[PDB]
Amino acid sequence: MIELRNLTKWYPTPHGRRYVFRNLNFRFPDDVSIGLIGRNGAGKSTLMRLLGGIEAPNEGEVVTDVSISWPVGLSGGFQGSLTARENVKFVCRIYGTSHEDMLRKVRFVEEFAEIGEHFDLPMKTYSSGMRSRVAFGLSMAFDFDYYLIDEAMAVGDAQFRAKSRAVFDSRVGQANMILVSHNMNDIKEYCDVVVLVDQGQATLYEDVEAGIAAYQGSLKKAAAKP
Amino acid sequence: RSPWQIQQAVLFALFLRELKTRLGGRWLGVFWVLLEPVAHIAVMTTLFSLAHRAAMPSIEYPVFLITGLIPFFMFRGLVTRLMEAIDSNRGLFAYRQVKPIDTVIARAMLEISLQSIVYLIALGTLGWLGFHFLPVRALELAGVSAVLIMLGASLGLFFAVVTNEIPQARAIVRISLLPLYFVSGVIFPVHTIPPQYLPLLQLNPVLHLIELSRASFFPQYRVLQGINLAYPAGFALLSLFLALMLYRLRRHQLAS
Amino acid sequence: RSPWQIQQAVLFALFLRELKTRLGGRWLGVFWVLLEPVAHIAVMTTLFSLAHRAAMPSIEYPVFLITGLIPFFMFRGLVTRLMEAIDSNRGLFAYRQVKPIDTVIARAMLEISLQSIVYLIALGTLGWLGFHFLPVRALELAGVSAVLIMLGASLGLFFAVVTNEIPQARAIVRISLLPLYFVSGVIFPVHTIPPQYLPLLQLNPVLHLIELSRASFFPQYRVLQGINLAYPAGFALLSLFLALMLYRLRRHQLAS
Amino acid sequence: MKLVSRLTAKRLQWALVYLPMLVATVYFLVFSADRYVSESVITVRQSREDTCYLQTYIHSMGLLQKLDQQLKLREHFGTPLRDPLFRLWGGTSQEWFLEYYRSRVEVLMDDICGLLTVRVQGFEPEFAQALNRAILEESERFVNELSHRMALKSLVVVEPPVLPEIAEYPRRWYNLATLLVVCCLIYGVVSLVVATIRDH
Amino acid sequence: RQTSREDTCYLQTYIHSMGLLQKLDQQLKLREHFGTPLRDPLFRLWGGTSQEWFLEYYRSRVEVLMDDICGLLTVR
Amino acid sequence: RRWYNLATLLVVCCLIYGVVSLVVATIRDHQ
Amino acid sequence: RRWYNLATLLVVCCLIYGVVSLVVATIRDH
């Protein structure tokens, strides 16, 4: 169960408060896959960050009784001067995971990353792909009830993308996923319900096709505005 | 999952995380942090030995200097590393159950443990040289040290919360700390300065704490009037209440 | 496109870049860079006025203290801001036609201009209070100031090149600068300290520079023996040659 | 490293908190012996050099031999068989006897008056007062003899030695409390250090 | 005063001395007077207390302050 | 003191030339 | 003092050698 109660989030600008959400109250459907769609700047990424706990709402709150993951593939939470083994160890201490569990978590991340000796080298020497790989491994290291993706399927090379797709296909049936993607084929394949974000309001569609049609109609209406 | 267990886990993670940054990667930060007191000891012993002999022929300079210098180092370290705690780990706030107060108190406990180690090492090497190291009254010394630690941590937390989104204030409080080295009378005994400027110097709580620590540490140490523990104790309690209240008021804005 | 022209353009750009960063975002940095000297003026005047009166009844404390404190502030600012120049703009070397030496000399000229402005303001406010401000021998004072500026910039560049890929050294040189405040004899006249420790204190070049600046600034100021300009001049020349040579050797490795 | 992780918590808890306090409580509440204190405050007048000589003379060896001849300190201090720490074991060396005596009598002098205070410990209050009185008499005779040997001066007793009613130095509760504080601090530091070495 | 600081600081030491306490207890019966308030158990002299505790109580009840710039003894 | 002065002036001139040449090379390194 | 003088001369020779080594590394850089 995920609920946004009185969620009001704004951005500080010199011309005033750029409000993104105003008194947003919305209940996510339970034990289903969610496709968060909307226009550019409508508020998909910030809502995903609010769900993942990266950014706290200015007003209201998010109430959840299930585990919500961080953006998968995000390298912003790392330390450049700290190596990957100590980084995933620190993330393990964040969630209070036991020593044996941390060991395998570390071994699993190291084996999935396929980086090598640079696994004992810090992120300030890493590239974008290396950071994406280690972030993806640290994301899969924990069994989350909900996994959040924002265009994380286009990272890495073809082999890494295929490995991630196979892993997530094996994961399907064990955990839920909130996906923010501009490609509606992925929404049709991976998501069971659709949540459209527009003008600070979230609308739920139990049918993926209906939500896609509604978003396309909203885009056409926006383009038709003179 | 009670809040206490996750709080303890994240505190331990932050503490060892800070320990890694503060100490050298080659495990050599202890060398510099032990060099810091001995240089001051050397320069003050070569600069004010005969002045202290003229001051009082009862307590030798090295122990009297250490027993005031190390608590002052603990205080300045607490203030300095506590005021910079929040604006050093902005990315780490991305994870849930992190908070800034956990970072500031992890830095506080790291500083406390490190300076306790330095104090124990200094007392050991002082007793190895034939000096006097055993405190005559250790309970009063422990209470005074606890009050000083609480005051330093409270001031550091207050400066961390208040001077958010203005680094420049952090630039000036440091220059306020330099005269406090001489105002507090840690180096030279305060019994020598004439009373004409005493009351203005009685408003420094760390002065009262240092004289009371010296009185509880040494046998037959004369403490002058108006060096009660009540004034620094009330200062520390009021500042801690104010800092906690200000942090509670500005909670989500500090996380950012 | 002559090398001097592009060098001047990038120096002006880098110069204003350092300016924006050093000065406040609300055009307020002049306030604190004027507040730093006056606090030390106040505390030293309230702490050592009668001591200076007992020292010599010829030169009043404010002008004598300013004329040594401002050059020392310029020297310490040059060293501190110069040694941190390379490891502050690591994202600036991505563009070509730029070098770390451009950043260090832009910071040097910014510090020189700021401290020259502060010195002129202090001299003006000193002459507005009825004191003596006009230098009796200004050419010798200018030469001494130039030597001190070159020595400070050279030491800062040397510490910038040498202590790359080890920030911990930058942690300890600050604690090497605090005793230098009292060793140099800027606050109190050096004529009072007994000669028993003079030969150890004559190895400080900034001491010689400060006494020579005071001698060239004041009429009938007695300079003690062994305060020749030759020793600090040779120190500055040798250090500048060594620093430029070390920069030239570690040129491509510095920028990364 | 195999035993480094084997210290766990309960072993460290036991061997660093509870066993030392068991032995401390057992010693203080049963094995300890009371040590009464007699306090005197004297000065020398016709002069900081003179009370300096006196302060050196109180802890000297010749005064110790004279007092041992007079009052038999070695026999008196060996009586408390229950206390093994603060008793004078028989057949011990002369140097240890001097160190023990110097520990038993504490000599202090204020710098702003020159008053010299002495506190003499003994296992019987009358013996402590007698030892303090003998110390004062021998000091007076010593300064008079030093004045006479050159070829005038007398001791001033601001406070004559008292006869104590109860002993004051073997404080058991205060020692237990400061042991609590020191033990807790030593636990905290060593547990933090064992945690960080184990995490490595 | 004669007809310095040494004699008045000797007095400062002597006011809290045990011999003066014995003389005052003989003269004025301090033990009997300081045990009269029974409703106050914190600032009363309990019966059958040790001589050391009696001396500490007397030192708490009599406060002696020294003015060094004037050399004046204030006894409260 | 002819020889001491000559040696000191030679060392000083060598250091000055080294500094000037290094500064000139650093200025030239802007292509 | 033969050994003290030899140690001092060794130290100053090592320092001189280091200085000329860095100088000759600098000039050799084209």
Identify the H or E element spanning D117. Answer: strand D116-122
The CA-atom distances, in angstroms, between B72 and each of B75, B83, B184, B229 are 5, 17, 9, 17
Identify the H or E element spanning C231. Answer: helix C230-249
A150 is in an annotated binding site: yes
Instruction: Please report how the helices B100-127 and D172-199 are oriented relative to each other, as an axis angle in degrees rounded to 10.
Output: 120
The CA-atom distances, in angstroms, between D51 and each of C190, D43, D98, D142 are 39, 7, 21, 12
DSSP string, B35-67: HHHHHHHHHHHHHHHHHHHHH-SSS-HHHHHHH
Top residue of B95, B164, B252, B256 to mutate, by most chain A CBs within 10 Å, is B95
Identify the H or E element spanning C161. Answer: helix C138-162
The answer for C97, left when phi > 0, alpha when psi is -120 to 50, beta otherwise, is left
Instruction: Report the Cα C128 to chain-centroid distance in Å.
Output: 26
Identify the H or E element spanning B156. Answer: helix B138-162
Identify the H or E element spanning A203. Answer: strand A201-205
Mark yes or no for CB contact D159/E14 under 8 Å: yes
Query: CA A148, CA B106: separation in Å to the nearest integer?
Result: 31
Give the end-to-end CA distance of chain C in Å, rounded to a whole number: 25
Mark yes or no for CB contact C32/B197 under 8 Å: no
Query: CA G27, CA G30: separation in Å to the nearest integer?
Result: 7
The CA-atom distances, in angstroms, between B29 and each of A83, C160, C171, D144, D192 are 20, 21, 11, 61, 17
Cβ contact B139:D181 at 8 Å: yes
DSSP string, D131-156: HHHHHHHHHHHHHHHHHHHH---EEE
- Please state whether beta strands A146-150 and A34-38 pair in parallel, antiparallel, or not at all (unpaired): unpaired
- In this complex, the chains that touch A, judged by 3 or more CB pairs closer than 8 A, are B
Length of chain D: 200
Cβ contact E11:E73 at 8 Å: yes
Nearest alpha carbon to residue F11 among C151, C154, C234: C234
Query: CA A87, CA A78: separation in Å to the nearest integer?
Result: 7
Name C237's Cβ contacts closer than 8 Å, sequence gap at least 6.
F12, F15, F16, F19
Mark yes or no for CB contact D189/B139 under 8 Å: no
Q: Which amino acid is at C174?
A: R
What dihedral angle (degrees, nearest 10) is formed by the CA atoms of C203, C207, C213, C215? -90
The DSSP code for B2 is -
Mapped to the 3 state alphabet, what secondary structure does C63-118 carry?
Answer: HHHHHHHHHHHHHHHHHHHHHCCHHHCHHHCCCCCCCHHHHHHHHHHHHHHHHHHH
The distance of B181 to chain C (nearest Cα, Å) reads 11
CA angle B108, B109, B112 (to 5 degrees): 90
Mark yes or no for CB contact F22/C4 under 8 Å: no
The CA-atom distances, in angstroms, between C235 and each of C146, C209, C239, D121, F15 are 14, 11, 6, 65, 12
Mark yes or no for CB contact A93/B12 under 8 Å: yes
Is residue A142 exposed (0-12), middle (13-18) or buried (19+ Cβ within 10 Å)? middle
> Which residues from chain B sit within 8 angstroms of residue A94, using beta carbons?
9-10, 13, 95, 97-98
CA angle B48, B54, B55 (to 5 degrees): 85
Nearest to F19 among C3, C101, C241 (CB): C241
Cβ contact D82:D170 at 8 Å: no
Nearest alpha carbon to residue E5 among B56, D110, D159: D110
Helix then strand then coil, in percent of chain F rounded to 5, is 85, 0, 15
Token digits for D193?
A: 């250090």
The CA-atom distances, in angstroms, between D90 and each of A161, C247, D64, D80, D100 are 86, 75, 17, 12, 13
Greatest alpha-carbon span in chain D: 78
Gyration radius from chain A CA atoms: 19
A8 is in an annotated binding site: no
Cβ contact D153:D62 at 8 Å: no
Q: Which residue of C has its CA nearest to B34?
A: C172
Token digits for D154?
A: 């007398």
> Which residues from chain B sit within 8 angstroms of residue C43, using beta carbons?
179
Query: CA C60, CA A11: separation in Å to the nearest integer?
Result: 57
Instruction: Please report how the helices B61-83 and B205-217 are oriented relative to each other, as an axis angle in degrees rounded to 10.
Output: 140
A147 is in an annotated binding site: no
Token digits for D31?
A: 């094995």
Instruction: Report the Cα C35 to chain-centroid distance in Å.
Output: 17
Is residue F28 exposed (0-12), middle (13-18) or buried (19+ Cβ within 10 Å)? exposed
Query: CA A161, CA A183: separation in Å to the nearest integer?
Result: 16
Beta-ladder partners of A17: A12
A75 is in an annotated binding site: no
Q: Which of residues 153-172 of D touch E (CB under 8 A)?
A: 158-160, 162, 164-166, 168
Phi, psi of E19 (to 5 degrees): -65, -40
Mark yes or no for CB contact F19/C3 under 8 Å: no
The 3-state DSSP class for residue D197 equals: helix
Q: Which amino acid is at C137?
A: R
Name C42's Cβ contacts closer than 8 Å, sequence gap at least 6.
none
Query: CA B137, CA A134: separation in Å to the nearest integer?
Result: 56
Nearest to D160 among E13, E19, E51 (CB): E19
For A21, other C-beta atoms within 10 Å of its C-beta total 25
Token digits for A180?
A: 């923010």
Token digits for A172?
A: 């399907």
Name C99's Cβ contacts closer than 8 Å, sequence gap at least 6.
C255, F26, F29, F30
The DSSP code for D15 is I
Nearest alpha carbon to residue A102 among A112, A113, A91: A91
Q: Which amino acid is at B66?
A: I
A42 is in an annotated binding site: yes
Query: CA C237, CA D25: separation in Å to the nearest integer?
Result: 71
Mark yes or no for CB contact B91/A77 under 8 Å: yes
Sign, Cα dihedral of C136, C142, C143, C145: positive
Query: CA E15, CA B131: separation in Å to the nearest integer?
Result: 34
The CA-atom distances, in angstroms, between B28 and each of A122, B23, B53, C49, C241 are 20, 7, 37, 44, 32
The 3-state DSSP class for residue A36 equals: strand
A125 is in an annotated binding site: yes
Q: Which residue of G has its CA nearest to C238?
A: G19
Tokens 């084209």, residue?
G30
Cβ contact C185:C207 at 8 Å: yes
> Which residues from chain B sit within 8 angstroms of residue A52, using beta carbons?
96
Query: CA E60, CA E70: separation in Å to the nearest integer?
Result: 24
Query: CA B254, CA E37: separation in Å to the nearest integer?
Result: 58
Instruction: Report the Cα A105 to chain-centroid distance in Å.
Output: 20
Exposure b/e, D20-52, CB count within 10 A at least 16 = b: eeeebeeebeeebbbbbbbbbbbbbeeeeebbe
Instruction: Report the Cα D13 to chain-centroid distance in Å.
Output: 32
The distance of B177 to chain D (nearest Cα, Å) reads 28
Phi, psi of E17 (to 5 degrees): -70, 160
Query: CA D58, CA D44: separation in Å to the nearest integer?
Result: 13
- Please state whether beta strands A146-150 and A68-71 pair in parallel, antiparallel, or not at all (unpaired): parallel
Exposure b/e, B220-236, CB count within 10 A at least 16 = b: ebeeeeebeeebbbebb
Mark yes or no for CB contact C36/B175 under 8 Å: yes
Instruction: Report the Cα D171 to chain-centroid distance in Å.
Output: 13
The DSSP code for A172 is B
Query: CA C132, CA C126: separation in Å to the nearest integer?
Result: 7
Gyration radius from chain G CA atoms: 13
DSSP string, A46-107: HHHHHHHTSS--SEEEEEESS-EEEETT--TTS-TTSBHHHHHHHHHHHTT--HHHHHHHHH
Nearest alpha carbon to residue D199 among A86, A138, A94: A86
The CA-atom distances, in angstroms, between C46 and each of B224, C42, C126, C191, E69 are 23, 6, 18, 21, 22
Long-range contacts of D94-102 (CB under 8 A, 24+ apart): D97/D64, D98/D61, D98/D64, D101/D59, D101/D64, D101/D73, D102/D59
Query: CA B174, CA B80: separation in Å to the nearest integer?
Result: 8
Cβ contact B225:B82 at 8 Å: no
Cα atoms in the Cβ-side hemisphere of radius 13 Å centred on D122: 23
> Which residues from chain B sit within 8 angstroms of residue A56, using beta carbons?
252, 255
Interface contacts B/D by beta carbons within 8 Å: 30
Name A129's Cβ contacts closer than 8 Å, sequence gap at least 6.
A155, A156, A157, A160
Token digits for C25?
A: 């975002």
Mark yes or no for CB contact C172/B35 under 8 Å: yes
Length of chain G: 30
Mark yes or no for CB contact C248/G23 under 8 Å: no
Nearest to E18 among D159, D166, D168 (CB): D159
Top residue of E5, E8, E17, E49 to mutate, by most chain D CBs within 10 Å, is E17
> Which residues from chain D sit within 8 angstroms of residue B142, using beta carbons?
178, 181
Mark yes or no for CB contact C237/F28 under 8 Å: no
The CA-atom distances, in angstroms, between A49 and each of A143, B93, C59, C72 are 19, 12, 67, 51
Nearest alpha carbon to residue A33 among A174, A167, A156, A153: A174
- Determination technique for this PDB entry? cryo-EM
Name C63's Cβ contacts closer than 8 Å, sequence gap at least 6.
C126, C131, C132, C133
> Which residues from chain C sit within 8 angstroms of residue G29, using beta carbons?
248-249
Is residue B203 exposed (0-12), middle (13-18) or buried (19+ Cβ within 10 Å)? exposed
Cα atoms in the Cβ-side hemisphere of radius 13 Å centred on D69: 7
Cα atoms in the Cβ-side hemisphere of radius 13 Å centred on A22: 6
Cα atoms in the Cβ-side hemisphere of radius 13 Å centred on A176: 18
Q: Which residue of D has its CA nearest to E54?
A: D165
Query: CA F14, CA G19: separation in Å to the nearest integer?
Result: 14
The DSSP code for D29 is I
- In this complex, the chains that touch B, judged by 3 or more CB pairs closer than 8 A, are A, C, D
Nearest alpha carbon to residue B105 among B173, B142, B146, B160: B160
The answer for A114, left when phi > 0, alpha when psi is -120 to 50, beta otherwise, is left
Mark yes or no for CB contact C245/G29 under 8 Å: no
Sign, Cα dihedral of A209, A211, A215, A218: positive
Exposure b/e, C162-186, CB count within 10 A at least 16 = b: ebbeeeeeeeeeeeeeeebeebbbb
Token digits for D140?
A: 């007076």
Is residue D145 exposed (0-12), middle (13-18) or buried (19+ Cβ within 10 Å)? exposed
Mark yes or no for CB contact A90/B98 under 8 Å: no
Query: CA C48, CA C53: separation in Å to the nearest integer?
Result: 9
Q: Do chains D and F touch (3 or more CB pairs under 8 A)?
A: no
The 3-state DSSP class for residue A25 equals: strand
Nearest alpha carbon to residue D80 among D99, D65, D100: D100
Cβ contact B213:B141 at 8 Å: yes
Q: Give the resolution to one decimal, in Å.
A: 3.4
E19 touches chain D (CB under 8 A): yes
Query: CA C83, CA B201: separation in Å to the nearest integer?
Result: 37
Q: Which of residues 135-174 of D touch B (CB under 8 A)?
A: 174
Nearest to E9 among D113, D159, D166 (CB): D113
Q: Do chains C and G touch (3 or more CB pairs under 8 A)?
A: yes
Nearest alpha carbon to residue C55 among C245, C193, C228: C193
Q: Which residue of C has its CA nearest to F29?
A: C3
Identify the H or E element spanning A3. Answer: strand A2-13
The distance of A211 to chain B (nearest Cα, Å) reads 31
> Which residues from chain G sit within 8 angstroms of residue C248, using beta carbons?
26, 29
Sign, Cα dihedral of B67, B70, B73, B77: negative
A46 is in an annotated binding site: yes
> Which residues from chain G sit within 8 angstroms of residue C249, using beta carbons?
22, 25-26, 29
Nearest alpha carbon to residue C165 among B89, B16, A81, B85: A81
Exposure b/e, B74-83, CB count within 10 A at least 16 = b: bbbbbbbbbb
Nearest alpha carbon to residue D112 among E2, B189, E68, B227: E68
Query: CA C131, CA C127: separation in Å to the nearest integer?
Result: 5
Instruction: Report the Cα A147 to chain-centroid distance in Å.
Output: 6
Sign, Cα dihedral of E45, E46, E48, E53: negative
Gyration radius from chain D CA atoms: 23
Nearest alpha carbon to residue E74 among B223, E5, E63: E63
Q: Which amino acid is at D105?
A: V
Q: Where are the alpha helices (DSSP H) in chain D?
A: 10-13, 19-26, 48-58, 61-71, 73-77, 94-104, 125-150, 172-199
> Which residues from chain B sit within 8 angstroms of residue D178, using beta carbons?
138-139, 142
Cβ contact D119:D38 at 8 Å: yes
Cβ contact C74:C122 at 8 Å: no
E49 touches chain D (CB under 8 A): no
Identify the H or E element spanning G23. Answer: helix G2-27
